[PDB]
Design an enzyme around this catalytic site. Structure first.
Site, PDB file in Angstrom:
ATOM      1  N   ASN A 133       0.822  -1.200   0.000  1.00 53.91           N
ATOM      2  CA  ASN A 133       0.000   0.000   0.000  1.00 53.91           C
ATOM      3  C   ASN A 133       0.850   1.240   0.000  1.00 53.91           C
ATOM      4  O   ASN A 133       1.777   1.369   0.795  1.00 53.91           O
ATOM      5  CB  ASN A 133      -0.907   0.027   1.220  1.00 53.91           C
ATOM      6  CG  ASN A 133      -1.866   1.194   1.201  1.00 53.91           C
ATOM      7  OD1 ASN A 133      -1.579   2.258   1.753  1.00 53.91           O
ATOM      8  ND2 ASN A 133      -3.015   1.003   0.571  1.00 53.91           N
ATOM      9  N   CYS A 155      -1.830   6.741  -5.700  1.00 54.50           N
ATOM     10  CA  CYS A 155      -3.177   6.690  -6.299  1.00 54.50           C
ATOM     11  C   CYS A 155      -3.429   5.464  -7.168  1.00 54.50           C
ATOM     12  O   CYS A 155      -3.533   4.384  -6.650  1.00 54.50           O
ATOM     13  CB  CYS A 155      -3.460   8.000  -7.040  1.00 54.50           C
ATOM     14  SG  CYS A 155      -3.273   9.391  -5.911  1.00 54.50           S
ATOM     15  N   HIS A 199     -10.093   5.762  -2.393  1.00 50.89           N
ATOM     16  CA  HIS A 199      -9.695   4.366  -2.397  1.00 50.89           C
ATOM     17  C   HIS A 199      -9.694   3.813  -3.839  1.00 50.89           C
ATOM     18  O   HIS A 199     -10.720   3.825  -4.545  1.00 50.89           O
ATOM     19  CB  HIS A 199     -10.640   3.570  -1.484  1.00 50.89           C
ATOM     20  CG  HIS A 199     -10.164   2.184  -1.178  1.00 50.89           C
ATOM     21  ND1 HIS A 199     -10.991   1.082  -1.252  1.00 50.89           N
ATOM     22  CD2 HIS A 199      -8.948   1.719  -0.795  1.00 50.89           C
ATOM     23  CE1 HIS A 199     -10.305  -0.003  -0.932  1.00 50.89           C
ATOM     24  NE2 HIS A 199      -9.058   0.352  -0.667  1.00 50.89           N
ATOM     25  N   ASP A 240      -6.761  -5.096  -3.973  1.00 52.08           N
ATOM     26  CA  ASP A 240      -7.013  -3.943  -3.120  1.00 52.08           C
ATOM     27  C   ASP A 240      -5.695  -3.834  -2.410  1.00 52.08           C
ATOM     28  O   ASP A 240      -5.530  -4.338  -1.298  1.00 52.08           O
ATOM     29  CB  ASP A 240      -8.176  -4.285  -2.184  1.00 52.08           C
ATOM     30  CG  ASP A 240      -8.554  -3.159  -1.235  1.00 52.08           C
ATOM     31  OD1 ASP A 240      -7.955  -2.052  -1.279  1.00 52.08           O
ATOM     32  OD2 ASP A 240      -9.480  -3.408  -0.408  1.00 52.08           O
TER      33      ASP A 240
HETATM   34  O1  LIG Z   1      -7.121   9.093  -9.793  1.00 50.35           O
HETATM   35  C1  LIG Z   1      -7.464  10.080 -10.446  1.00 50.35           C
HETATM   36  C2  LIG Z   1      -7.960  11.290  -9.626  1.00 50.35           C
HETATM   37  C3  LIG Z   1      -9.208  10.879  -8.867  1.00 50.35           C
HETATM   38  C4  LIG Z   1      -9.958  12.084  -8.174  1.00 50.35           C
HETATM   39  F1  LIG Z   1     -10.929  11.628  -7.339  1.00 50.35           F
HETATM   40  F2  LIG Z   1      -9.069  12.886  -7.400  1.00 50.35           F
HETATM   41  N1  LIG Z   1     -10.112  10.262  -9.778  1.00 50.35           N
HETATM   42  C5  LIG Z   1     -10.669   9.058  -9.556  1.00 50.35           C
HETATM   43  C6  LIG Z   1     -11.497   8.780 -10.563  1.00 50.35           C
HETATM   44  C7  LIG Z   1     -11.425   9.829 -11.366  1.00 50.35           C
HETATM   45  F3  LIG Z   1     -12.060   9.915 -12.366  1.00 50.35           F
HETATM   46  N2  LIG Z   1     -10.586  10.774 -10.905  1.00 50.35           N
HETATM   47  N3  LIG Z   1      -7.397  10.142 -11.820  1.00 50.35           N
HETATM   48  C8  LIG Z   1      -6.911   8.989 -12.632  1.00 50.35           C
HETATM   49  C9  LIG Z   1      -8.092   8.596 -13.551  1.00 50.35           C
HETATM   50  C10 LIG Z   1      -8.253   9.678 -14.533  1.00 50.35           C
HETATM   51  O2  LIG Z   1      -6.888   9.896 -15.123  1.00 50.35           O
HETATM   52  C11 LIG Z   1      -9.333   9.251 -15.565  1.00 50.35           C
HETATM   53  N4  LIG Z   1      -9.431  10.279 -16.595  1.00 50.35           N
HETATM   54  C12 LIG Z   1      -8.531  10.222 -17.625  1.00 50.35           C
HETATM   55  N5  LIG Z   1      -8.538  11.198 -18.641  1.00 50.35           N
HETATM   56  C13 LIG Z   1      -9.444  12.205 -18.557  1.00 50.35           C
HETATM   57  C14 LIG Z   1     -10.323  12.238 -17.527  1.00 50.35           C
HETATM   58  C15 LIG Z   1     -11.083  13.296 -17.717  1.00 50.35           C
HETATM   59  N6  LIG Z   1     -10.692  13.921 -18.831  1.00 50.35           N
HETATM   60  N7  LIG Z   1      -9.657  13.267 -19.374  1.00 50.35           N
HETATM   61  C16 LIG Z   1      -8.982  13.551 -20.524  1.00 50.35           C
HETATM   62  C17 LIG Z   1      -9.644  13.708 -21.691  1.00 50.35           C
HETATM   63  C18 LIG Z   1      -8.969  13.951 -22.890  1.00 50.35           C
HETATM   64  C19 LIG Z   1      -7.579  14.070 -22.923  1.00 50.35           C
HETATM   65  F4  LIG Z   1      -6.893  14.323 -24.159  1.00 50.35           F
HETATM   66  C20 LIG Z   1      -6.885  13.914 -21.727  1.00 50.35           C
HETATM   67  C21 LIG Z   1      -7.601  13.654 -20.559  1.00 50.35           C
HETATM   68  C22 LIG Z   1     -10.348  11.312 -16.549  1.00 50.35           C
HETATM   69  O3  LIG Z   1     -11.205  11.393 -15.633  1.00 50.35           O
HETATM   70  C23 LIG Z   1      -8.717  10.948 -13.780  1.00 50.35           C
HETATM   71  C24 LIG Z   1      -7.754  11.324 -12.654  1.00 50.35           C
END
Ligand SMILES: O=C(C[C@@H](C(F)F)n1ccc(F)n1)N1CCC(O)(Cn2cnc3c(cnn3-c3ccc(F)cc3)c2=O)CC1
Length: 337
Positions: free
Chosen positions: A7, A12, A253, A270
């Protein structure tokens, strides 16, 4: 059968992605073959990935990732906060494609993960069309106001008009009324889909998580989105992995569900705890609605499933690599005692 990753809250989505890649067995075998023998123990990302993969494959205890994070230089709290998951994937897969260059496994990353699409502008009232081919390794799908993966795809290839303010410029012809769009020419054997759940908000100048319901199927037919179908290789996809997140922020999480061997027998990873789970827990339960939900999905094409998930035995690991990791372990246990 399978072992977890230790962990490391600040990293993330990293652990979930490492498992996803580990279980792309054809990638994994190619990774084990990289000529790393000369690499620097602490600066080599290719070596550090081999080490994580080896240990996930042989350790009874949860596997560490600090040598890996050092190697690619994301050692701060907000290294992971300033990047999207697919950006991590690119950093990893690029280092690895480059190290495979000039070897018998050259071209493995493109072969598994790269597709081609056409982006085009068509003018309405004059004959002039522009076509451009782009490669992609992943697809970002919109989910806001879409019920399901099918609807996201329909929106991805939906035609966008250009006129009035937004007119297109057709050189010789003039500024013109036009239509803009994308179609897929090919879809790769392993398809990485990110769901756009994390979106910028001007009203509050900050990224917010959207937790709405978004349905994705176990079996995903994508022929409708190809510019030309192949009746001998239908674009039928099988769900392999579902990367999931709970809560509203980078403190939430992160877990991943996999059916490693493609047979619909699922597990939940997990961090250090790996447990069997139902198909319903991996799929339906992470649609959202009702803050736990999927932000990335991995599908494998049906006609490639056997190849992509071919068994990997310890015979597939050059002995030079086994000896170097086993020597690292010998010396850590030595300083320990
Ligand atoms: O872990 C996180 C942050 C957390 C948040 F709660 F702080 N998170 C968890 C889920 C989620 F969607 N975001 N992330 C990793 C998952 C994530 O990369 C998924 N994602 C990927 N590309 C995206 C997202 C939104 N827009 N884009 C995007 C769209 C087009 C582009 F050319 C580049 C990026 C997106 O939500 C979003 C950020």
């Amino acid at each position: 059968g399978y072992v977890g990753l230790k962990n490391q809250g600040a990293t993330c989505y990293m652990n979930s992605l490492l498992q996803t890649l580990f279980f792309t067995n054809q990638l994994r075998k190619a990774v084990y073959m990289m000529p790393t023998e000369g690499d620097d123990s602490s600066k080599s990302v290719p070596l550090a990935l081999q080490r994580v993969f080896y240990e996930l494959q042989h350790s009874d205890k949860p596997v560490g990732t600090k040598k890996l994070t050092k190697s690619f230089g994301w050692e701060t709290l907000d290294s992971f906060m300033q990047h999207d998951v697919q950006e991590l994937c690119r950093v990893l897969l690029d280092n690895v494609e480059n190290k495979m260059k000039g070897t018998c496994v050259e071209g493995t990353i493109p072969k598994l993960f790269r597709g081609k699409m056409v982006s085009y502008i068509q003018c309405k009232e004059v004959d002039y069309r522009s076509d451009r081919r782009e490669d992609y390794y992943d697809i970002q799908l919109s989910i806001k106001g879409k019920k399901n993966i099918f609807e996201s795809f329909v929106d991805y290839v939906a035609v966008e008009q250009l006129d009035g303010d937004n007119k297109y410029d057709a050189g010789e012809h003039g500024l013109q009324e036009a239509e803009k769009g994308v179609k897929f020419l090919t879809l790769p054997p392993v398809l990485h889909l990110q769901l756009m759940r994390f979106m910028y908000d001007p009203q509050t100048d900050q990224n917010i998580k959207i937790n709405d319901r978004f349905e994705f199927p176990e079996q995903l037919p994508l022929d409708e989105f190809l510019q030309k179908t192949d009746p001998k290789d239908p674009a039928n996809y099988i769900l392999h992995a579902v990367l999931v997140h709970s809560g509203d922020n980078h403190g939430g999480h992160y877990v991943v569900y996999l059916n490693p061997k493609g047979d619909g027998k699922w597990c939940k990873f997990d961090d250090d705890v790996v447990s069997r789970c139902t198909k319903e827990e991996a799929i339906e339960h992470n649609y959202g609605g009702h803050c736990t939900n999927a932000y990335m999905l991995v599908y494998i094409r049906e006609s490639k499933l056997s190849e992509v998930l071919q068994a990997v035995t310890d015979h597939d690991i050059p002995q030079q690599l086994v000896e170097r990791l086993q020597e690292e372990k010998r010396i850590e246990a030595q300083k320990r005692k």
